[PDB]
Design a binder for this molecule. Structure first.
Ligand SMILES: O=C(CCCCC1CCCCC1)N[C@@H](Cc1ccccc1)C(=O)O
Ligand SMILES: C=Cc1ccccc1
Ligand SMILES: [Cl-]
Length: 454
């Protein structure tokens, strides 16, 4: 039994001022590098323990001992994501009900149905880049976010955000991005009831109202038309939970749509951006991935079956998730009094944070080359220790979108590697912006067309 380390304190504010930064996850990674596999983090009226080693995280991933916790970040996001799948407690009726109803929508009949709409958006991205002039560059995270938002809009509720037709966001997205910014900014406020935050509070309620008004209109319009699209909204309007026999109510469907749009905007776009970053920084890996794309993608339009054959592209995506997991943390609570690692006694209700980027750098798991981008690490899942790789979280509360995201990302990256050569023309220095998620900021490349028709 030993005392865990704690980073530097600021009197009555304890550790809170350490998160007064635009890059708090990267700050917590530096603290983990200094203090090791576990540290205490205290703020006024709150304690969490940050875990970084596979040794402790394999225990934390035991669902008999620990359940998903809503981090303060998720509690603030719940003001607009409500009891949707990501901001619900496991014990809330609406978690298991929505999980049971939505699981068939997210399976590997389900990706075959979504494939054609994913191709529609992927083709828009390829045509955009084919149409750039010689002296122009690609803003990578910007274009990847246009793609992933458009894909979830089409697959979510048959709606075209038309992101490739715009410089300026759709009004829903203005409010969504501003609500996500307020939720994350609220984490670093020592005195949140200070009148200096009154405007922030008013704007937040306005953005919540905008998202609720616009999503509630989508649901009403669909019910009125009777239209039966192969989309998540149709599955949610028609689906019955096999346990209760009940469908979701319109309020919960609204929270699920808001949840899916947040995920679609924030997560897959980061993965694609980091994957292209690592490929241009590792030209031998880019060549091996481009050779696979050329051999497999023999038709103008990729098929579902061809995307499943892009094995090396899948490994590239897993190795990008290893080094920069775009959703970089998840939170757990102790279901009962328990001892972590034979060393750290926890009381029922005690909170843990899994620092996924630090887990993914455990040299006792990955070896001395842990900072190197080597997709071959993922050739054999049986050679990877248990709970070493957690970019989609854990257990029954793991990402329901994992297959959807990896299908979209594999399709798009395959088509990108088929259609273009890439140049890191600025020798880009990685700068990671933190919203809900991690994305390269300012990452630009030049694409040279291979002139292969669509
Ligand atoms: O670890 C963090 C900061 C990065 C979370 C990032 C996380 C948010 C969900 C999507 C995945 C990434 N926050 C903890 C501790 C805390 C609590 C209150 C005030 C300040 C810090 C929390 O949100 O509980
Ligand atoms: C962890 C991913 C996530 C996805 C949507 C909303 C909040 C969090
Ligand atoms: Cl102090």
């Amino acid at each position: 039994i030993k005392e865990m380390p704690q980073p530097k304190t600021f009197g009555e504010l304890k550790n809170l001022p350490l998160l007064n930064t635009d890059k708090p996850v990267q700050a917590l990674m530096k603290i983990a590098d200094e203090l090791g596999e576990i540290f205490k983090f205290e703020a006024p009226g709150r304690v969490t323990r940050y875990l970084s080693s596979q040794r402790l995280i394999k225990e934390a991933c035991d669902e008999s001992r620990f359940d998903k916790n809503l981090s303060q970040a998720l509690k603030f996001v719940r003001d607009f994501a409500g009891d949707g799948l990501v901001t619900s407690w496991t014990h809330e009726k609406n978690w298991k009900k929505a999980h049971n109803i939505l699981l068939p929508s997210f399976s590997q009949q389900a990706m075959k149905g979504y494939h054609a709409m994913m191709v529609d958006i992927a083709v828009q991205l390829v045509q955009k880049w084919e149409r750039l002039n010689a002296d122009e560059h690609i803003e990578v995270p910007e274009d990847m976010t246009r793609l992933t938002l458009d894909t979830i809009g089409l697959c979510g509720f048959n709606y075209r955000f038309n992101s490739f037709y715009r410089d300026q966001p759709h009004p829903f997205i203005t409010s969504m991005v501003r609500a996500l910014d307020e939720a994350m900014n609220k984490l670093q406020r020592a005195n949140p009831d200070d009148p200096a935050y009154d405007e922030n509070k008013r704007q937040f309620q306005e953005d919540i109202k905008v998202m609720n008004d616009l999503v509630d209109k989508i649901i009403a319009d669909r019910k009125a038309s009777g239209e039966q699209s192969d989309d998540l909204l149709t599955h949610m309007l028609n689906g019955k939970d096999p346990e209760t026999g009940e469908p979701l109510d319109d309020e919960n469907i609204r929270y699920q749509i808001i949840t899916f749009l947040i995920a679609g905007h924030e997560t897959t776009s980061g993965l694609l951006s980091f994957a292209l970053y690592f490929l241009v920084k590792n030209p031998h890996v880019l060549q091996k991935a481009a050779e696979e794309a050329a051999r497999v993608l023999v038709d103008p339009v990729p098929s579902y079956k061809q995307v499943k054959q892009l094995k090396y592209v899948g490994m590239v995506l897993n190795e990008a998730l290893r080094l920069w997991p775009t959703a970089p943390a998840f939170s757990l609570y102790a279901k009962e009094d328990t001892v972590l690692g034979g060393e750290y006694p926890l009381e029922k209700g005690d909170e843990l944070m899994v620092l996924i980027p630090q887990l993914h750098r455990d040299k006792t798991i990955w070896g001395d080359d842990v900072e190197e981008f080597r997709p071959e690490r993922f050739e054999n899942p049986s050679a990877i220790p248990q709970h070493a790789f957690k970019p989609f979280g854990n257990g029954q509360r793991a990402c329901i979108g994992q297959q959807f995201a990896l299908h979209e990302a594999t399709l798009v990256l395959g088509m990108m590697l088929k259609h273009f050569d890439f140049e890191d023309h600025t020798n880009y220095e990685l700068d990671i912006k933190e919203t809900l998620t991690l994305k390269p900021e300012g990452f630009v490349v030049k694409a040279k067309s291979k002139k292969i028709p669509l």
